Design a protein around this ligand. Structure first.
Ligand SMILES: O=C(/C=C/c1ccc(O)cc1)O[C@@H]1C=C(C(=O)O)C[C@@H](O)[C@@H]1O
Length: 431
């Protein structure tokens, strides 16, 4: 797979936008470190029109007016806290061609070479030196096209990011903004003085391997990225296994599936029985906060659930015990818990230490982030909804994504990075 860059524009908002410094909340900071990668694939309609760069760039310009922080830069304030400099510097927009065809990607596992569909960002220079959002339209030999998105994590979680990408697609089709973005993260400010009510397991360091891992089997260089589809048959069977061993409790489809992936990764890694394994669950707090955030709220509302088990229990007990741990952590996260979380973060001297990253998800642990409830298939720019949308790469061993079906057949996909030798075994997930 070879990419030939054709054009490259720094697209700025269509009109003047507020010059201001946009404050980041604590959950805007403890978010992962770079640009969240996502990719969209589109069949050709047969039209010459197809993903016309001018249409895209003009629509992008317009959308960058209500969503003007998206065209800003990272900077530090006087106390050294990272904030968004709303300077309207612009968004990088690349047009590329490739002799490859879409079908060459087979199943769209977010491998390294799929990452090639998003432009690369050099973070090693200034914090201020790179766009918050990088975009690439790649035209394939088959007439199809892909949209690679790389959005700096401080700017937006999935709900706010797709609020922009979809408003953009709407604007490309001549439509107007629907829900205007609410741009003020101070709603997620910690109380004064802070007052944690809980011990937040989610922000305690992840279990390490009791036995150090072989750096030739472990590490970035010998990790595989695959995806797997589960049919609604397999999912229905899965939720029904809540019955097993006389358990009367009914857990959610997401709980049983997450528990199943967690348990299946555990078996695959051949963990010792006394080894602890921590599951990281990105959790939208929009529905839990009880004053309740405005529609269009622009930023991160990601809070974090972290069920934990000893592999001995996790692998020997039925799947619903895993579901139980997950449920027990998810159900505690009401508004009172999330307010605690903000206060707890506030009382840490160095938030950079809590920024989740490779060390967070790597074996013996696991991250599972659900995109199932995200409107990922709504980006229609005038030539149809995408046939596929998922992560643009999974850079961290141990991180995984749950994607919804592009066709509403009740199937789900798990996209995941594991160490090579564990990946084959991880088909054990189709038990
Ligand atoms: O899900 C997201 C971002 C999604 C997103 C999708 C489309 C966009 O246009 C913009 C953002 O962030 C997550 C944060 C992580 C965390 O909180 O640990 C764990 C990671 O797997 C994951 O990337």
């Amino acid at each position: 797979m070879k990419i030939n860059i054709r054009d490259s524009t720094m697209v700025r908002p269509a009109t003047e936008t507020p010059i201001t410094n946009l404050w980041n909340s604590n959950v805007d900071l403890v978010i992962p470190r770079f640009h969240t990668p996502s990719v969209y694939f589109y069949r050709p309609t047969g039209a010459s029109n197809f993903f016309d760069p001018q249409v895209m760039k003009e629509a992008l310009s317009k959308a960058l007016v209500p969503f003007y922080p998206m065209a800003g830069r990272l900077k530090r304030d006087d106390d050294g806290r990272i904030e968004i400099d709303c300077n309207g510097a612009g968004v990088l927009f690349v047009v590329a061609d490739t002799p490859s065809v879409i079908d060459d990607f087979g199943d769209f596992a977010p491998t390294l070479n799929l990452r090639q569909l998003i432009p690369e960002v050099d973070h090693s220079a200034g914090i201020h030196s790179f766009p918050l959002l990088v975009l690439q339209v790649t035209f394939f030999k088959c007439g199809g096209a892909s949209l690679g998105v790389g959005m700096q994590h401080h700017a937006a979680d999935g709900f706010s990011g797709l609020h922009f990408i979809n408003t953009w697609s709407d604007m490309a089709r001549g439509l107007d903004l629907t829900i205007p973005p609410f741009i003020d993260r101070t709603l997620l400010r910690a109380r004064d003085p802070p007052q944690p009510a809980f011990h937040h397991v989610e922000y305690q360091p992840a279990p390490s391997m009791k036995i150090p891992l072989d750096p030739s089997k472990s590490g970035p260089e010998n990790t595989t990225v695959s995806i797997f589809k589960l049919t609604r048959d397999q999912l229905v069977a899965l939720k029904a296994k809540s019955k097993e061993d006389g358990n009367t409790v009914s857990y959610s489809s997401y709980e049983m599936l997450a528990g199943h992936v967690w348990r299946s990764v555990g078996k695959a890694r051949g963990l010792p029985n006394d080894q602890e394994t921590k599951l990281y669950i990105a959790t939208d707090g929009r529905s839990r906060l009880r004053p309740q955030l405005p529609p269009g709220y622009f930023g991160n509302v990601i809070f974090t659930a972290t069920p934990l088990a000893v592999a001995g229990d996790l692998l020997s007990k039925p799947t619903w015990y895993a579901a139980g741990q997950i449920h027990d952590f998810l159900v505690r996260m009401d508004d009172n818990y999330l307010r605690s979380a903000l206060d707890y973060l506030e009382m840490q001297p160095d938030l950079s230490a809590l920024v989740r990253g490779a060390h967070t998800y790597k074996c013996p642990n696991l991250g599972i982030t659900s995109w199932v409830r995200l409107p990922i298939y709504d980006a229609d720019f005038g030539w149809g909804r995408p046939i596929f949308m998922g992560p643009g790469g999974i850079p961290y061993e141990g991180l995984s994504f749950v994607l919804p079906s592009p066709t509403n057949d009740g199937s789900l996909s798990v996209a995941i990075a594991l160490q090579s030798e564990h990946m084959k075994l991880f088909e054990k997930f189709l038990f």
